[PDB]
Design a protein around this ligand. Structure first.
Ligand code: SAH
Lengths: 6, 231
């Protein structure tokens, strides 16, 4: 789903 | 030297395709079958997502001389049916769901309640092995799952989807987009691709771009999210 930018 | 400033295709970041898929399948089997599970801890953004999707999609259903129909939709990587419940079932007479994780499709029967009686087929299948039926769907909705397919599988899947569309039908991809290149998430075993890479894959599937929209009002810390309408 939505993911924190690496 | 040979090492480029960054990667721009999945073959540069996926070491072993078999393991890429098996690790992803294992990952999802272990996620709770809940909205917050589907959204990786962002359950609190679900309404923002759904309401924007509805506005994006309604234009195709309600406006123009060649409207998209409302008979049948396919929800791809549907999970427990978060999108099926709030976006698709209220707009389409019938919905099919496809997802690799059987337990999510099982939970969907509970999660969707009485309106779930209008979900017809629950296909338990990886998209990479799935062939949607020719001339079957007005809308094929693919959200938060394209990063789980390799470039070749995504291109071919989208091509099969094109053949599945009914007259005036569309495919929608709504997903995370990287600022630049192709980034591997080795925890859930997925990739995140930039806009150019996704555009190339769409083109390779023989699809045309009808609309492209960046999702507003999302958490500041997450990847940008774009919707593409295609046919
Ligand atoms: N190769 C694959 N084929 C089909 N589904 C896959 C897949 N890899 C992961 N998935 C599914 O992709 C989903 C990602 S979570 C997102 C669920 C839904 N699209 C929503 O937005 O609410 C999970 O349900 C998971 O089981």
């Amino acid at each position: 789903x939505p993911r924190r930018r690496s | 030297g040979l090492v480029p400033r960054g990667s721009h295709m999945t073959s540069e970041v996926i070491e072993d395709e078999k393991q890429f898929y098996s690790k992803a399948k294992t990952y999802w089997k272990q996620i709770p079958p809940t909205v917050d599970g589907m959204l990786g801890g962002y359950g609190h953004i679900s309404s923002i997502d759904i309401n924007s999707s509805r506005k994006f999609l309604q234009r195709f259903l309600r406006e123009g001389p060649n409207k998209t129909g409302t008979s049948c939709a396919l929800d791809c990587g549907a999970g427990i049916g978060r999108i099926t419940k709030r976006l698709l079932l209220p707009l389409f007479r019938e919905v099919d769901m496809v997802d690799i994780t059987e337990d999510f499709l099982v939970q969907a029967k509970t999660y969707l309640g009485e309106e779930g009686k209008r979900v017809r087929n629950y296909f338990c299948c990886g998209l990479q092995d799935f062939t949607p039926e020719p001339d079957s769907y007005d809308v094929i909705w693919i959200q938060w799952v394209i990063g789980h397919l390799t470039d070749q599988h995504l291109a071919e899947f989208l091509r099969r989807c094109k053949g599945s569309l009914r007259p005036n039908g569309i495919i929608v991809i709504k997903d995370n987009m990287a600022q630049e290149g192709v980034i591997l998430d080795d925890v859930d075993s997925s990739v995140c691709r930039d806009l150019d890479v996704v555009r190339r894959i769409i083109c390779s599937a023989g699809l045309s771009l009808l609309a492209e929209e960046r999702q507003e009002n999302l958490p500041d810390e997450i990847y940008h999210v774009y919707s593409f309408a295609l046919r």
